[PDB]
Every structure is written in structure tokens, then in C-alpha cells.
């Protein structure tokens, strides 16, 4: 019950959020952004996926 | 005497020895399972969430 | 023993690749694992200094909204890939390099104008692919030295600057024991860098900076 | 009346406060409910059952 | 004490028989956490009786669940009390209000 | 690369228990880092001096009661646990508490010593309720750090302490709550220089001018490893 709440909160998306619309070179960088506080978890972004 | 060396002996014995855990009642076979044990200071049995 | 806190001895370097390692510290006093791990993370991830590309000027294009032909990938993708480039710049604040390429084939980082003072740590870094017989590109790439990861908050084109070489650092604390207590902390630190700086030395630098900030009070 | 009483103190009328994680110094996203709940130690302590 | 209650404690703790209750009004004369002696006022004093009422508080004693049920005083020397007031708080009770 | 180093520019001792201290200048992010790291260190590792053992003249066990006292022996022990004192250059000390007569028994009744300083003399231990009532106890105070419960202590003493020696749980940590607030400072006509202000509520045994320095020393000595690679 608790884990699914965390995943639901992490992958949800908001309309306007901090760090919205930029381009991320890869998932790792995305994590850095969150831990540096420059971006919100629900921000909409384009990341290069493999 | 609970000698400090006896705790090393226990940490060697329990290395790869499974322990069976079962809750009462056990309606289905998934209620009894084997686990690799690890020593804990307290008196409660640490169980996994999943 | 009122001033005799336990000092850990590194169990291993636990290297998994030339970029990332699994530096583990053991053992630490309860509550000291996070106090050190989070501080090291907060230093490395946002305050480490380095040289990175911050501005670009591609030939005859005003903005990445315009997708010039002759290149398989679009200008936005070109900018992100150039952001992915890791550089080692010696003794300058900002530099202007020029990359020029021609012919049917990909563009690789080995083609930049090596000044000799500038070290491109990954010559094999792919830039883009040219898609015509006469397909030729030439661009002026601006590098600058700074600290941290500066976002795009600021014929030039701005790009996010990855001054800090640490691609990713993550740490965990776990239970460790001595002959009489199981409350101590073992700190497993993992870091992956861009390759300009080896991880094992990078943390060596990080604590350094932190230690400096403590100099005025420690006796 | 609960809101009025909270207004008498300098406490927030929302009932929810923002907290900071002690391990990392970060602020939890969105406020959390904090108060004084009356708790009782039931007579089922583990040392009587292990 | 409970911060949020329903006011029923002021009765449940009193009628439980576990707290020492002043039989008559008067003024406290001596307390030693074991015996509280009250100078019951002459208005309710029997003409021939002592006119001074003891209260031998019960200290640590085992209960049916192997718990302690000692009663501790809450009144002060010289404090006036009226008949029905809780003199010594029992277990799980404090200042005459039930507190689990 | 422009990092500046912090200096304890000012300390405001607003009370005998509450104080504030500002560290300036600090670059970006260091305010959070220093604030939280030093908060954790000060909460966890700060040594203090607390009561460790008690021995009252005519009592046998903590569950008994003394004649002519309003508080049971357990409540006396708890009140003693609340006592906070200073010691000058010693690892342990034994203080005698001699008192008689109707009235309270406050910390002032303890035989004062040149090396022993009490942060709050208005601490009440118990109330005597008889004219001839009197209690004499030999309180033992020890330095240390952290919280050491009495159950752990005796099993580590490895000797049988004599009948009549009661053991209390010592909370050596003299700080109660540490908060840090980060705010900008007008330095060098440039912004993004955080002034870290730490406000601490203590028992009054230690002065922050030494508490923060000891915390920083602990942090640096622990940090020696990561630069020793």
C-alpha cells in the first residue's frame, strides 16, 4: 500500500511546474536536477531514453 | 556466559542456514516460507514488506 | 573516551568501471553516516568546479526552433548532445573552439580544433550524422569554467552547463556491528563521473572543500 | 470552533505545517498534519511473548 | 492528563475507588506520601470522636495483571479540602482526572 | 572558484539557556549543508555532565519511600535526573545534599564546590513535610556523551554495586533543540551570500562559542578519512 503511493506520486505530472519544458540529456542528469532542487518531480520534460 | 566470541560463532553458524516462518492460521501454502536470517538487536522479528 | 569518536577504515574501493565506483566506509557512529554522506553529495552535485560548454554558434541558424537540413538530428538534439560533451580546459576561464566537418558520415568529438591546451576527454563522443554528399558543418563552441550545474535560466545559443563532473552520486547507510553493539553505520557511496576526473579522487576533492569551510572553528 | 481556537494561538488555521527532514535538511513537499495525539501503551509488550 | 477529553474522567476516576477521597471537609495537617492526615473541620466533627481523619495511602502493590497500584498525594500541607475531593491520585489518575 | 570561509561574526546570548550565533559569509548551498550537518552533530555528539548514581541515607531501593517527604524516591530520582550542573576539569564528582526542616529541597541545599556550578539553582528536588524531617544523599555526577540507560551501565560495570546505590539514566547531551535559519548578507556588494544563524536551546551547561567549535572539530576529524583516500 505505501510503495504504490510513492510510485503514483513520483510518476504523476502537473501542468505548470518548476523545471518545465527543458531538454535533459539522459535519466541520470534528470535525477541530479531533482536533487539539486532545480526541477520539480512532476515537471514535464524531454529526456533522451534508451 | 554469552561471551563475545560466542557471538562470532553465531555469526558464522547462521551464515547460510534458512529458517522457516509461518503465521497462524496458514490457510494456503504461501503462509510458510524460508528466509535467510540476519541478527537483530531487538526482540521482534523483522519481516519484509513485499 | 568523551572525545574518541570512531574513525572508519575503507573496506574497499569496490570499483566497477573507470567511471563509477562503490567507495564504502566502515564503521561510523550512529547518526554520522548521513551527516557525512548527504554533505558530500551536496558538495559534489552542485558545487564542484569544472569546465563545460555554455554557448554555441552554429553556421547560419538563429535558434534551435529552426532545423537546418543536412544533419540527421535536429538542432535541439545537437545542443543536448554537445551538452553531453566532457572537456578538460587548462588555465583559461572561457575558450572558443571551432568544429568543422564534411562528407557523408557522422561527426565525432575527435574532429574539434585541439589547441593543445584543451583536452577533450572523449574524442569518440558522437555529435551528429551528416546526410548529404556536400553535407558540411562548422560551429563555434564556447566553453567556460565555473561551478555546479547552471541551468538555462540565463547568433548565440545557450546550453545547460555541466561544470560539475559528477554524473551521479548516491549513498546508503546500513547496519554494522563491533563485538558488542550492532548500532553502527556502514556508508556505501556510489558515484559516476563524466570521466575528466576519476571518482576516487573526486570525493578526495569534495571533503577538501568542506574541510576548508570548517577551518575557522576547529582547534 | 477548532479553527477559531487555532486562530487564538499563532498556529496556522490550516492545521497542517511544513516539516524538514532531519537527515538531509530538505523541506517536505506540501504541509503535513502535526498535533498532540493521546497515546496509550497497551498491555501486550513483546518481552512477555518472545 | 489528556489534552482532549470528554469530561467523563472527573467521574470515572473518582468512582473507581482507586483514588483517596476526602470523607469530610477540612484542612490538611501532615502528608508523607504514605499517610495524609486531615483536620476535619468542627462543622462535621463528631462531638466525642477524634476530629482528625487519617488516610493511609497504599504504596506499590501488585495488581491482577502484575502492575503497581501505588497512590501518590496531590494536596499540600495546609490546603483546605471539601468532602468528596480527591486527595491522592491513584494509578492512571492525576489531579482527579483519569489519564491512561 | 571564489569560495569564502565562514567566521563566527556575532553571538547573542539571549538567555541562560537560549542563544544564537551567526556564521558569515557562506556561499550558495553551504548554508543548508553547514546548518544541517552542524545541527545533527550538536544534537548527537555534544558531551555534557549528568547525574549517574544516587545514594540516599535511609532508603534501600528506588521503589521505597522516605518518611516525611512529599515525593516518593522514584520522583526524587527523576527530579535529580533533571538536574544540570557543570564540573571544572574532572571526570566524576560526588556531591552531598544535606537538608532538614519543613519546606522545599532545592539544588541550593547541595554542598557547593569551587569546580561545580549549577545552571539553575531554583531546581526543586523534593518537599520536606515534617519539622524533624531530613534527607541526606550522595549524588554522583559524570561526564560523557549520548544517553546511557542504567540497565546498560551495570552490565558494563561488571561488578555488583552495593545495596543502596540507585542508578539513574543519564542524558549527557546538554542541548534540547537546534534550529538553523539561512538569510542573505550585505557583503562585498554581492548577493547569494548566506548568513547562517543557529539558534540553540540548551540546559545552560555549555556556551555556544565552544559548542559550535567542538561540533566543527568533530566534523573535520571525521572528514579526515574521505581526504585520506
Amino acid at each position: 500500500q505505501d510503495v504504490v503511493l510513492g510510485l503514483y506520486y513520483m510518476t504523476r505530472d502537473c501542468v505548470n511546474a518548476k523545471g518545465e519544458g527543458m531538454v535533459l540529456t539522459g535519466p541520470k542528469e534528470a535525477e541530479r536536477l531533482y536533487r539539486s532542487g532545480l526541477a520539480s518531480l512532476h515537471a514535464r520534460v524531454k529526456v533522451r531514453i534508451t | 556466559r554469552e561471551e563475545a566470541v560466542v557471538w562470532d560463532i553465531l555469526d558464522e553458524v547462521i551464515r547460510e542456514h534458512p529458517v522457516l516462518l509461518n503465521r497462524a492460521p496458514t490457510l494456503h501454502r504461501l503462509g510458510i516460507q524460508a528466509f535467510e536470517p540476519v541478527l537483530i538487536e531487538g526482540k521482534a522479528i523483522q519481516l519484509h514488506p513485499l | 573516551s568523551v572525545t574518541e569518536f570512531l574513525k572508519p577504515r575503507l573496506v574497499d574501493i569496490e570499483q566497477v568501471s573507470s567511471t563509477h565506483a562503490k567507495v564504502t566506509l566502515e564503521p561510523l557512529e550512529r547518526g554520522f553516516g548521513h551527516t557525512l554522506g548527504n554533505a558530500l553529495r551536496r558538495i559534489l552535485l552542485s558545487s564542484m568546479p569544472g569546465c563545460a560548454v555554455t554557448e554555441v554558434e552554429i553556421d547560419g541558424v538563429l535558434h534551435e526552433y529552426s532545423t537546418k537540413e543536412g544533419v540527421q538530428e535536429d538542432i535541439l538534439e545537437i545542443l543536448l548532445n554537445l551538452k553531453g560533451l566532457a572537456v578538460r580546459v587548462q588555465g583559461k576561464d572561457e575558450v572558443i573552439l571551432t568544429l568543422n566537418k564534411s562528407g557523408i558520415g557522422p561527426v565525432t568529438a575527435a574532429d574539434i580544433t585541439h589547441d593543445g591546451d584543451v583536452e577533450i576527454v572523449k574524442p569518440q563522443h558522437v555529435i551528429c550524422h551528416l546526410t548529404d554528399e556536400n553535407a558540411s558543418i562548422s560551429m563555434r563552441i564556447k566553453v567556460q569554467r565555473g561551478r555546479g550545474y547552471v541551468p538555462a535560466s540565463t547568433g548565440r545559443l545557450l546550453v545547460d552547463a555541466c561544470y560539475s563532473p559528477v554524473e551521479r552520486i548516491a549513498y546508503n547507510v546500513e547496519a554494522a556491528r563491533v563485538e558488542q553493539r550492532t548500532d553502527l553505520d556502514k556508508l556505501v557511496i556510489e558515484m559516476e563521473t563524466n570521466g575528466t576526473i576519476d571518482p576516487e579522487e573526486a570525493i578526495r576533492r569534495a571533503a577538501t572543500i568542506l574541510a576548508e569551510q570548517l577551518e575557522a572553528f576547529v582547534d | 470552533e477548532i479553527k477559531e481556537l487555532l486562530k487564538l494561538g499563532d498556529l496556522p488555521t490550516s492545521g497542517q505545517i511544513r516539516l524538514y527532514d532531519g537527515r538531509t535538511g530538505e523541506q517536505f513537499e506540501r504541509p503535513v498534519t502535526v498535533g498532540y495525539m493521546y497515546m496509550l501503551k497497551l498491555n501486550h509488550l513483546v518481552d512477555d511473548k518472545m | 492528563k489528556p489534552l482532549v477529553g470528554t469530561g467523563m474522567e472527573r467521574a470515572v476516576a473518582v468512582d473507581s475507588g482507586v483514588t483517596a477521597v476526602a470523607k469530610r471537609g477540612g484542612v490538611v495537617q501532615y502528608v508523607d506520601a504514605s499517610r495524609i492526615v486531615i483536620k476535619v473541620n468542627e462543622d462535621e466533627m463528631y462531638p466525642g470522636e477524634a476530629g482528625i481523619d487519617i488516610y493511609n495511602l497504599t504504596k506499590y502493590t501488585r495488581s491482577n495483571q502484575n502492575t503497581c497500584i501505588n497512590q501518590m498525594p496531590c494536596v499540600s500541607l495546609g490546603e483546605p479540602v471539601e468532602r468528596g475531593d480527591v486527595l491522592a491520585d491513584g494509578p492512571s489518575t492525576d489531579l482527579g482526572e483519569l489519564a491512561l
Side-chain angles (χ1 to χ4, degrees), chain A, chain B, chain C, chain D, chain E:
Chain A
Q1 57 163 61
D2 287 63
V3 168
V4 62
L5 174 60
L7 271 90
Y8 184 85
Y9 182 86
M10 182 177 57
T11 64
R12 204 138 166 269
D13 59 333
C14 179
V15 174
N16 193 81
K18 187 180 175 186
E20 180 195 13
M22 66 197 317
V23 172
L24 270 26
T25 185
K28 281 185 178 58
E29 149 155 323
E31 208 291 314
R32 159 171 35 177
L33 272 187
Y34 166 76
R35 215 52 60 100
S36 69
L38 295 177
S40 187
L41 199 56
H42 311 129
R44 177 169 290 97
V45 75
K46 314 175 186 305
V47 311
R48 166 183 286 183
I49 231 64
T50 163
Chain B
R1 296 299 184 271
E2 60 179 357
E3 299 289 342
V5 62
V6 187
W7 302 108
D8 298 320
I9 293 295
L10 178 77
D11 206 11
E12 175 189 349
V13 167
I14 213 177
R15 187 74 183 95
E16 325 233 7
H17 195 171
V19 291
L20 283 181
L21 279 72
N22 64 276
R23 178 176 166 270
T26 150
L27 293 320
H28 65 332
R29 36 169 277 177
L30 303 178
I32 309 190
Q33 286 182 25
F35 305 84
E36 284 193 3
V38 284
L39 294 320
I40 295 300
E41 283 287 342
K43 304 180 189 59
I45 288 184
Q46 298 269 312
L47 210 66
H48 192 259
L50 296 178
Chain C
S1 297
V2 305
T3 326
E4 199 64 25
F5 300 89
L6 302 161
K7 292 172 178 56
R9 303 321 305 164
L10 40 106
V11 72
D12 205 329
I13 60 179
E14 212 88 325
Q15 181 177 7
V16 54
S17 178
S18 175
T19 42
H20 33 299
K22 193 139 293 183
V23 184
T24 297
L25 268 297
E26 186 175 356
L28 285 168
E29 283 283 350
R30 174 187 51 185
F32 272 78
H34 277 285
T35 301
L36 304 179
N38 185 244
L40 291 182
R41 161 197 283 163
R42 215 158 174 89
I43 300 295
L44 284 165
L45 105 167
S46 80
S47 296
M48 269 286 297
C51 312
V53 170
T54 178
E55 303 183 37
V56 180
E57 289 79 11
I58 181 63
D59 57 289
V61 156
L62 292 180
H63 47 50
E64 86 297 329
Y65 176 84
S66 56
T67 58
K68 189 172 183 176
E69 232 289 334
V71 53
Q72 191 165 359
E73 9 283 339
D74 289 356
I75 307 299
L76 188 68
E77 188 154 13
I78 294 177
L79 207 60
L80 87 85
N81 183 92
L82 290 172
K83 178 183 76 174
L85 177 59
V87 194
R88 183 191 323 276
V89 182
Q90 296 177 154
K92 277 186 181 176
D93 286 332
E94 54 166 315
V95 197
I96 291 185
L97 309 152
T98 293
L99 203 169
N100 58 90
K101 190 73 178 312
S102 58
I104 313 179
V107 194
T108 69
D111 303 320
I112 320 180
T113 305
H114 282 295
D115 290 3
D117 179 68
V118 174
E119 292 186 355
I120 297 286
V121 301
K122 299 300 298 178
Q124 315 288 355
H125 194 303
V126 50
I127 305 300
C128 66
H129 288 237
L130 303 181
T131 53
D132 270 317
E133 325 103 328
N134 70 330
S136 180
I137 63 172
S138 187
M139 69 188 76
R140 293 202 302 271
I141 316 176
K142 176 162 294 185
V143 184
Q144 189 179 350
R145 159 168 291 269
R147 299 157 18 185
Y149 180 73
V150 180
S153 182
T154 54
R156 51 93 97 93
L157 283 185
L158 303 167
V159 69
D160 306 328
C162 52
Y163 301 145
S164 177
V166 173
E167 286 278 349
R168 167 170 185 264
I169 166 183
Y171 73 100
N172 309 127
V173 294
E174 45 195 15
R177 46 94 58 173
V178 308
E179 298 85 331
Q180 62 223 6
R181 49 194 166 179
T182 328
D183 50 357
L184 305 187
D185 298 359
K186 184 217 303 177
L187 181 72
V188 170
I189 298 187
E190 151 182 342
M191 59 174 62
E192 329 211 342
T193 133
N194 58 6
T196 74
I197 297 297
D198 285 1
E200 180 176 338
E201 200 274 349
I203 170 173
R204 295 182 187 185
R205 186 173 291 98
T208 315
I209 297 174
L210 195 54
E212 212 71 19
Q213 301 293 314
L214 317 168
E215 197 77 341
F217 324 129
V218 54
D219 292 331
Chain D
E1 295 172 335
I2 301 183
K3 303 297 175 51
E4 184 178 1
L5 182 60
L6 275 176
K7 183 167 58 184
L8 175 59
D10 259 322
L11 300 170
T13 59
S14 308
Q16 299 169 349
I17 327 172
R18 58 163 59 188
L19 293 190
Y20 298 76
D21 197 324
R23 295 161 307 172
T24 132
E26 63 198 354
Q27 155 191 346
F28 297 113
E29 300 197 358
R30 102 173 49 200
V32 299
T33 291
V34 169
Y36 285 78
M37 179 179 298
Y38 189 72
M39 305 226 69
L40 298 64
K41 178 183 179 182
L42 298 180
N43 195 269
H44 295 305
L45 66 170
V46 58
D47 47 62
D48 201 7
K49 295 171 171 299
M50 174 199 55
Chain E
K1 64 190 173 190
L3 278 184
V4 178
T6 67
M8 199 69 177
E9 311 87 353
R10 276 296 181 189
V12 175
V14 171
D15 288 0
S16 177
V18 83
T19 68
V21 182
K23 294 169 293 187
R24 294 173 293 178
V27 180
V28 185
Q29 180 178 330
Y30 179 96
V31 174
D32 60 335
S34 178
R35 14 169 291 100
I36 290 188
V37 11
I38 308 293
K39 180 155 188 176
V40 38
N41 189 261
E42 78 292 338
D43 53 3
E44 210 173 357
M45 177 186 66
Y46 303 159
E49 220 269 316
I52 164 183
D53 227 326
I54 68 166
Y55 287 102
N56 290 26
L57 311 183
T58 160
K59 307 313 292 181
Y60 298 90
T61 299
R62 69 174 308 273
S63 62
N64 296 16
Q65 312 286 158
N66 291 337
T67 64
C68 62
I69 54 183
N70 76 321
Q71 300 175 4
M72 299 192 61
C74 73
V75 300
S76 298
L77 210 159
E79 179 181 356
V81 298
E82 194 62 281
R83 160 176 182 175
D85 287 324
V86 176
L87 296 182
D89 300 309
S92 293
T93 62
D94 199 340
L95 290 188
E97 290 180 9
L98 190 69
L100 291 320

